[PDB]
Amino acid sequence: VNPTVFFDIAVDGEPLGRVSFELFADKVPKTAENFRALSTGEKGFGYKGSCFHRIIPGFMCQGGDFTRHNGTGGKSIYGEKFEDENFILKHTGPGILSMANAGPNTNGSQFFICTAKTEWLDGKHVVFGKVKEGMNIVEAMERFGSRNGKTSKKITIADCGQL
Amino acid sequence: VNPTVFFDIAVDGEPLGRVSFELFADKVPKTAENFRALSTGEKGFGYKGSCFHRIIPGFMCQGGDFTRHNGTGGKSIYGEKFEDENFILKHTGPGILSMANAGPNTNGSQFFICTAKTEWLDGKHVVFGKVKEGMNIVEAMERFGSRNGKTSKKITIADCGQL
Amino acid sequence: GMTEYKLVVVGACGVGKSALTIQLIQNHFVDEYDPTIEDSYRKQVVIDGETCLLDILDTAGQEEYSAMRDQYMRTGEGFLCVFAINNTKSFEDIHHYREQIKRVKDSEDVPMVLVGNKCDLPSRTVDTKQAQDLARSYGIPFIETSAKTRQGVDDAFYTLVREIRKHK
Amino acid sequence: GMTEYKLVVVGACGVGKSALTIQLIQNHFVDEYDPTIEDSYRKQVVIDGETCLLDILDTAGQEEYSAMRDQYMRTGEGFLCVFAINNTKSFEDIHHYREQIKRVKDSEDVPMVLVGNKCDLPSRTVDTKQAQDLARSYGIPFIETSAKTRQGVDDAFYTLVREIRKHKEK
Ligand SMILES: CCn1c(-c2cc(N3CCN(C4CC4)CC3)cnc2[C@H](C)OC)c2c3cc(ccc31)-c1csc(n1)C[C@H](NC(=O)[C@H]1[C@@H]3COC[C@@H]31)C(=O)N1CCC[C@H](N1)C(=O)OCC(C)(C)C2
Ligand SMILES: CCn1c(-c2cc(N3CCN(C4CC4)CC3)cnc2[C@H](C)OC)c2c3cc(ccc31)-c1csc(n1)C[C@H](NC(=O)[C@H]1[C@@H]3COC[C@@H]31)C(=O)N1CCC[C@H](N1)C(=O)OCC(C)(C)C2
Ligand SMILES: Nc1nc2c(ncn2[C@@H]2O[C@H](COP(=O)(O)OP(=O)(O)NP(=O)(O)O)[C@@H](O)[C@H]2O)c(=O)[nH]1
Ligand SMILES: Nc1nc2c(ncn2[C@@H]2O[C@H](COP(=O)(O)OP(=O)(O)NP(=O)(O)O)[C@@H](O)[C@H]2O)c(=O)[nH]1
Ligand SMILES: [Mg+2]
Ligand SMILES: [Mg+2]
Numbered sequence: 001v002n003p004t005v006f007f008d009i010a011v012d013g014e015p016l017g018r019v020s021f022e023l024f025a026d027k028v029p030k031t032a033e034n035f036r037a038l039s040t041g042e043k044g045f046g047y048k049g050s051c052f053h054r055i056i057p058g059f060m061c062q063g064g065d066f067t068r069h070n071g072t073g074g075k076s077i078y079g080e081k082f083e084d085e086n087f088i089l090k091h092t093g094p095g096i097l098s099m100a101n102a103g104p105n106t107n108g109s110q111f112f113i114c115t116a117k118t119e120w121l122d123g124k125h126v127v128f129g130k131v132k133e134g135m136n137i138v139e140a141m142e143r144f145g146s147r148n149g150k151t152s153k154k155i156t157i158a159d160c161g162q163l
Numbered sequence: 164v165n166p167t168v169f170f171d172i173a174v175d176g177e178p179l180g181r182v183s184f185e186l187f188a189d190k191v192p193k194t195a196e197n198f199r200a201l202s203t204g205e206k207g208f209g210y211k212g213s214c215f216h217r218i219i220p221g222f223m224c225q226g227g228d229f230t231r232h233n234g235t236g237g238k239s240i241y242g243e244k245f246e247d248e249n250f251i252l253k254h255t256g257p258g259i260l261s262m263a264n265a266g267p268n269t270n271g272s273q274f275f276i277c278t279a280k281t282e283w284l285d286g287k288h289v290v291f292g293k294v295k296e297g298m299n300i301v302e303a304m305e306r307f308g309s310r311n312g313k314t315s316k317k318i319t320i321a322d323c324g325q326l
Numbered sequence: 327g328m329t330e331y332k333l334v335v336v337g338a339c340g341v342g343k344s345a346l347t348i349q350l351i352q353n354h355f356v357d358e359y360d361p362t363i364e365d366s367y368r369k370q371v372v373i374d375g376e377t378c379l380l381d382i383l384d385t386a387g388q389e390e391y392s393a394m395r396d397q398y399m400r401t402g403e404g405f406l407c408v409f410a411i412n413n414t415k416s417f418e419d420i421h422h423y424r425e426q427i428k429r430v431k432d433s434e435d436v437p438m439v440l441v442g443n444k445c446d447l448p449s450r451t452v453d454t455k456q457a458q459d460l461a462r463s464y465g466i467p468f469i470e471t472s473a474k475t476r477q478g479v480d481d482a483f484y485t486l487v488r489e490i491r492k493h494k
Numbered sequence: 495g496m497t498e499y500k501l502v503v504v505g506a507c508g509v510g511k512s513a514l515t516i517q518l519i520q521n522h523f524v525d526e527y528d529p530t531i532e533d534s535y536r537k538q539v540v541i542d543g544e545t546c547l548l549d550i551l552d553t554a555g556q557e558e559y560s561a562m563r564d565q566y567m568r569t570g571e572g573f574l575c576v577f578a579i580n581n582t583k584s585f586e587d588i589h590h591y592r593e594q595i596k597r598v599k600d601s602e603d604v605p606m607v608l609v610g611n612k613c614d615l616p617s618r619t620v621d622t623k624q625a626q627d628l629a630r631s632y633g634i635p636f637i638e639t640s641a642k643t644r645q646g647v648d649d650a651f652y653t654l655v656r657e658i659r660k661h662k663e664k
Contacts, residue, residue, distance in 0.1 A: 056531075057368040058328060058379045072526040102529060115370070116328070120558060143352045147368050147381075148531040217363070220536040221496060221547040235358040265361060266339075279496065279538065279545070283390050306520045310536050310549070311363045 002026060003162060005039040007047070009137055010158040011144065019134030020163060021097050024089065024127075030078075031085045031099060031107065031128040037077045038066075038109055039160045045075070047109070052155040055145025059118060061138055062100055062149070063157065064110035074109035081106045084126055091118040095131030095138070113138050165189055168202040170210070171322035172300055174307065179318075182276075182297035183326060184260050187290075191248045193241075194262060194270065194291040200240045201227075201272055202323045208238075210272070215318040218308030222281060224301060225263055225312070226320070227273035237272035244269045252290035254281040258301070260292035276301055328370060330379045331487050334398050336423050337408035338387045338416035342443040345473035346408065347384045350483050355474055362386045373487050380487070387419070392426065399430040404437035404490040406482060409452065410444045411470070417442075417452045424464065437489040438466045441482050446472040496538065498547040499655050502570035504563070504591050506584040507555040509576045510611040513641030515552045518651055523642050530554050532566075541652050548651065560594070567598040572605035572658040574650060577620070578612040579638070585610075585620045592632065605657035606634045609650050614640040 003023050009016040023032035038046035045066065052063035053071040067073035076082050083105040091098060091114055098121070100110035107126060115138060131138060144153045165185050172179040186195035201209035208229065215226035216234040230236035239245050246268040254261060254277055261284070263273035270289060278301060294301060307316045335343040344365070345356050351367045367382040385398055399405075405427055409416040420440065427436055440461045442452060454470060461468035467485050471478035503511045507529065516524050519535045533552040538545060551566055567573075575591055577584035588608065595604050608629040610620065622638060629636035635653050639646035 054531075058370040068526070070526075070528065072528045102527065124558075142370070145368065147366065148533060219363070221538040231358070233358070233360070235360045265359065287390075305538070308536065310534060311365065 003032065003036050004132060005036055005162050006160060007039075007157045008159040009141065010156045011141075011153050013154075013156075013158075015158070016140060017134055017137040019137045020132040021129045022132045023097075023129040027088050028085045028126060028128040030082070031126050034076045034078065034082070034107075034109070035097075035111065035128065036162060038064075040162050041160075043077050047157045047160050050157050052141060052151065052157075054112075054149035055141055055151050055155065056147065056149050057115070057142040057145050059116055060112040060114050061141050061145070061155075062110065062112040063155075064100065064108075066109060071110075076108050081108050083107070085128075087123045087126065089127035090122045091125070091127060093117050095135050096127055097129035097131065099126040099128065101125060115139060115142055166195070166199050167295060167326045168199055169323060169326055170202070170320045172215075172304065173319045173321040175316045176319075176321075178321065179303060180297055180300040182300045183295045184292045185295045186260075186292040187252060190251050191289060191291045193245065194248045194289050197239050197241065197245070197270075197272070198260075198274065198291065199325060201229075203325050204323075206240050210320045210323050213320050215304060215314065215320075217275075217312035218304055218314050218318065219310065219312045220305040220308045221279055223275040223277050224304050224308070224318075225273065225275035226318075227263065227271075229272060234273075239271050244271055246270070247289050248291075250286045250289065253285040254288070254290060256280045258294035258298055259290055260294065261288045261290040264288060278302065278305060328377045328379045330381055331490055332401060332403045333380060333382045333406060333483065333486060334402035334404070335382065335384050335406045335408060336387065336395070336398075336427075337406075337441075338410075338413070338419045341387070341408045341410040341413060341416045342471075342473050343387070343406075343408050344384050346406075346441070346443060346471060346479055346482065347382055349473045349476055349479045351382070353476075355476075357474075371484075373484050374491075376491075378487065380483070382483075395426065396430050399427050403494075404439075404486045406439055406441055406486055408441040408443050409457075411442045411450050411452045411457075412444055412447050414451045417457070420460070435493065437486060437493045438464070439482060439486045439489060440464070440466055440468045441478075442468070442470045444472060444474070445470040445477060446474050496545050496547045498549055499658055500549045500551070500569065500571040501574060501651065501654055501658075502551045502553060502566055502572070503574045503576060504553055504567075504595075505555055505574075505576035505609075506578075506581070506587045509555070509578040509581065509584045510639075510641045511555070511574075511576050512552050514574075514576065514609070514611060514639060514647060514650070515550055517641050517644055517647045518548075518550065521644075523644075525642075529556075539652070541655055546655065548655070550651075560590075563594060564598050567595055572607075572654045572661075574609050574654055575606055576609045576611055577625075579610045579618045579620045579625075580612055580615050582619045585625070588628070603661065605654065605661045606632070607650055607654045607657060608632065608634055608636040609646075610636065610638045611641060613638045613645060614642050 006020045025032040050066040054062040065074040096114040169183040188195035213229040217225040228237045259277035365384045535550040637650040
């Protein structure tokens with residue numbers, strides 16, 4: 001059975017709500033395991049306390065940089081970066097969970113959640129999950145984004161783990 | 164005699180340097196006294212710890228909101244607001260120190276420092292001082308401003324008083 | 327990809343331009359007065375079946391900066407003209423904003439919506455009737471709003487999107 | 495008031511567009527990679543005894559979005575065309591940026607400066623004379639820069655301003 005993880009989101013320290021993700025371990029086991037482990041913190045580091053540094057209404061909410069907290073960092077449980085596992089799944093609509101990268105085979109910990117279909121990212125970013133509950137939480141997060149992604153409020157993963 | 168005051172300016176908590184001002188008590192005694200007292204804190208409240216919330220390169224640096232720390236607040240030693248003392252002095256060039264306001268006779272604690280001639284403000288904002296030492300610190304603060312004034316790092320008055 | 331609309335909120339200082347915009351974007355009400363330098367907002371919405379992307383410019387109504395407003399008016403497709411129903415002066419300024427828009431755009435036919443804001447306040451100096459008669463003269467919708475209570479906010483912006491759609 | 499100059503920094507990914515802009519604005523060197531969406535900056539400078547306001551647009555070089563450079567190219571007054579002297583492809587990409595600028599502005603006469611960045615690096619694949627010859631053929635200046643050492647940073651942006659002043663006949 002595919003694992004499920006959760007983020008508890010906070011805006012400037014104030015609870016917003018819980019969003020849960022199904023991670024498609026059946027098609028991308030390596031990429032899903034990295035996200036799962038970073039969500040539990042079991043390797044001694046992970047998403048807890050990190051912020052969503054880039055939110056662009058109409059497209060996606062991007063986060064996952066827990067090493068530098070400025071959108072340049074992050075690391076995987078396999079090392080700083082690891083290879084593109086596969087591109088079987090597509091960015092078909094809101095709720096899709098997919099890996100940020102800086103080109104081929106540069107997956108770290110940064111991820112983005114689609115608020116719309118983003119088909120031109122197919123074959124360039126590894127899709128590995130989907131919002132299970134709390135899409136409206138993600139939509140509420142759009143209220144604090146901007147055209148170039150800078151957020152007007154601090155959007156944090158106040159707690160996270162596996163369900 | 165015209166008193167002199169100083170701000171010790173910090174950037175994200177890191178000390179930047181000292182700016183001192185001559186206050187034109189010989190032309191606007193009521194306005195100069197207010198700024199002087201808020202710089203020493205002798206009335207129990209003032210600029211110490213407040214931030215420069217609006218920096219627009221090529222125009223001015225604005226601060227002084229110590230009651231709300233969001234650009235809408237501040238108060239004078241005479242109450243919430245006091246009248247426009249006069250408009251004898253003008254915004255002739257860099258270094259001018261003048262009062263922020265929200266319409267006639269709404270001076271509180273908010274102030275701004277010109278980094279260039281802003282003659283379209285003459286007759287509307289009460290000029291009451293000028294930078295004596297540390298204009299280079301004011302120029303440096305422009306490094307962290309933007310077109311609409313939002314700052315990219317937290318510029319604070321770490322210390323202040325009278326010389 | 328979703329269609330993009332460029333809205334511009336105009337009116338005198340303090341009428342509630344930003345409070346209306348913030349209420350539409352963030353479902354939040356600003357009870358303090360933070361006068362606007364200039365702010366741009368992005369929001370995705372579904373209007374009359376069409377998903378679209380709203381680009382909203384929140385402007386400053388200061389008279390000294392009229393020449394700068396011209397650039398706002400060149401790029402913008404539609405204009406929310408806001409006055410406050412307890413502020414007769416802001417109601418009289420509406421004529422001037424409309425004139426300026428008409429001039430810069432070289433056109434009598436520019437998507438526009440008159441907004442009487444702060445309709446929650448018990449004091450009132452601009453009657454609904456006066457603003458109706460003015461809007462009717464101009465040939466544009468008129469909506470009374472309260473950013474404090476959220477009344478009419480969505481109607482004002484979506485009505486403007488519809489006026490642009492009809493215009494385009 | 496002071497004259498405002500609208501400068502746009504363009505070039506392939508990773509050449510140092512943002513590093514150069516941040517050195518100009520904040521006088522320090524971003525050693526980490528923060529790939530740009532879009533960023534605008536303001537700085538007042540003195541150039542040839544005159545104070546002027548620089549408006550700098552830092553752009554994304556991603557090939558996926560080349561068909562959307564139209565907007566910022568139309569409003570920019572002058573363009574810093576940046577390549578990295580250790581990346582031949584970035585040098586070859588210059589041709590495409592210049593042509594696209596000329597097309598959008600529908601002009602063969604657009605203020606531009608050719609910038610060869612990363613000149614602190616020992617692994618140069620594009621020769622100075624190579625780039626000089628190209629700029630000569632374009633009729634534009636060429637400046638070698640290092641965002642790491644700050645070499646040529648001021649010179650590149652100021653030379654662009656001077657180019658814009660010329661094209662305006664002012
Ligand atoms: C041209 C403007 N412009 C747009 C864009 C585009 C459009 N459409 C394009 C599609 N058309 C459809 C077919 C019709 C219509 C017009 C409209 N309006 C815009 C914006 C708002 O105009 C300002 C974008 C965009 C993106 C970039 C640069 C410029 C961009 C960019 C830089 S780096 C990257 N992209 C990948 C990045 N990598 C890192 O963050 C690295 C950091 C360091 O190492 C780990 C870590 C990454 O993986 N992601 C995870 C995934 C989403 C992605 N970020 C992102 O944010 O894109 C934003 C956006 C808005 C989706 C695209
Ligand atoms: C149209 C854009 N635009 C400009 C402007 C203009 C120009 N020129 C003007 C001159 N032309 C020449 C004749 C040829 C050419 C075009 C160029 N570029 C710009 C900018 C960068 O484009 C965004 C401005 C400006 C100013 C405002 C709104 C919009 C503005 C504004 C809002 S409120 C206020 N102003 C007074 C405010 N009050 C409060 O904050 C209240 C808060 C609550 O109660 C206590 C407290 C206050 O006292 N100050 C302290 C003093 C300077 C002042 N803020 C401020 O920030 O001005 C900024 C700026 C840039 C100097 C002016
Ligand atoms: N009772 C009431 N008060 C309101 C309403 N909308 C805004 N206000 C208050 O009126 C004041 C002005 O609000 P603001 O939205 O900041 O005004 P603006 O019209 O954007 N001003 P500027 O042009 O100077 O940027 C603020 O204190 C705000 O809380 C409303 O619908 N009802
Ligand atoms: N040695 C050296 N490294 C540099 C120099 N300029 C930039 N770099 C490095 O090169 C990498 C890319 O730099 P960046 O400024 O991020 O590039 P861009 O040209 O803005 N890229 P994009 O189009 O993706 O936004 C970063 O690691 C940066 O530190 C330079 O002059 N010398
Ligand atoms: Mg406002
Ligand atoms: Mg960049």
